[PDB]
């Protein structure tokens, strides 16, 4: 049975010892887990999906007004079919790249740090901007709470992450649209935690040994472990190998990752061994992976 964890105690409810234990079991046995009781408003989620379908149904020429080339070093905007390079060929996939909304007078923008700056939003869906940023705020708060549960599940103090790597976290948010195939015909996330919202007719899969379906479950987010959490636990919490295998699907992966300048180190007690070998900051690490998916910029 797939692990579905009620995380209400980490959100708005009285404490329950079993929550941290269940998170630990899920990371050790499965590498991923569903969460319920996350506190993210369902109407906000429904409005994010509705405004997303509205955007992807626009004409291509309108969608390309917020194409990623206009996002600059901030790494934001729209990509059409073929716009992402995965498995060595342009992907039959379109989507949207978002990150923290930073004003131009923010020090990171004034320093010209890659992956920092403003998001792009379409003139044609005027209420999309507010919905997206409210969702990112809700998910950023959920991320911090889930890292506490992850800390507890390792026998650590609950604020272990907040005090070292995630006080000022790297938050990345994408909206992916998979059209039905034109004809009839594996990876790991790089940060700490992926919090994924799936649509109902979603088709996601995760490894085990065996590829298993991680079907959509109402009221849940699917969470999995990233390369940096793998590194920090010396491989105890294994970064989750997954893939998307039909018709028209939307998905909304949210990534809760370390500070851009954080050097995530293995716990001394688990440091017995990319990933475990990598010298540099999370920003260095993230930047290398971004250079491969978009050779443009
Ligand atoms: Mn992924």
Author numbering: 8 to 192, 199 to 221, 224 to 260, 264 to 291, 305 to 328
Lines quoted from the article behind this entry:
The ethylene-forming enzyme (EFE) catalyzes two main reactions: the conversion of 2-oxoglutarate (2OG) to ethylene plus CO2 and the oxidative decarboxylation of 2OG coupled to the C5 hydroxylation of l-arginine (l-Arg). EFE also facilitates two minor reactions: the uncoupled oxidative decarboxylation of 2OG and the generation of 3-hydroxypropionate (3HP) from 2OG. To better understand the evolution of this enzyme’s diverse activities, we demonstrated that two distantly related extant enzymes produce trace levels of ethylene and 3HP, and we examined the reactivities of 11 reconstructed ancestors. The structure of one ancestral protein was resolved by X-ray crystallography, while the others were modeled with AlphaFold2.
The Anc357 protein is a monomer in solution, however the asymmetric unit contains two molecules (chains A and B) with an overall Cα RMSD of 0.2 Å. The Anc357 protein structure includes a double-stranded β-helix (DSBH, also known as the jellyroll or cupin fold) core, an architecture that is widely found in members of the Fe­(II)/2OG-dependent oxygenases. The metal-binding site of the Anc357 protein resembles what is found in most other Fe­(II)/2OG-dependent oxygenases, with the metal coordinated by His200 and Asp202, that derive from the loop linking β5 and β6, along with His257 that is situated at the N-terminus of β10. An overlap between PK2 EFE·Mn­(II)·2OG·l-Arg and Anc357·Mn­(II) shows a Cα RMSD of 1.4 Å and reveals that Fe and 2OG binding residues for this ancestor match the situation for PK2 EFE. Similarly, the Anc357 residues maintain much of the hydrophobic environment of the 2OG binding pocket, although Pro93, Phe175, and Ala279 in PK2 EFE are replaced by Lys100, Tyr185, and Ser269 of the Anc357 protein. In contrast, however, there are large differences in the l-Arg binding site. Of greater significance, the l-Arg binding residue Arg316 of PK2 EFE aligns with Lys323 in the Anc357 protein. The Anc357 loop between β7 and β8, spanning residues 220 to 226 (shown in yellow), is significantly shorter than the PK2 EFE β11 loop, residues 209 to 237 (shown in red). The greatly shortened loop and changes at the l-Arg binding site of the Anc357 protein compared to PK2 EFE explain why the enzyme is essentially inactive. The crystallographically resolved structure of Anc357 reveals only small differences in the 2OG binding pocket but large differences from PK2 EFE in the l-Arg binding site, accounting for its depressed activity levels.
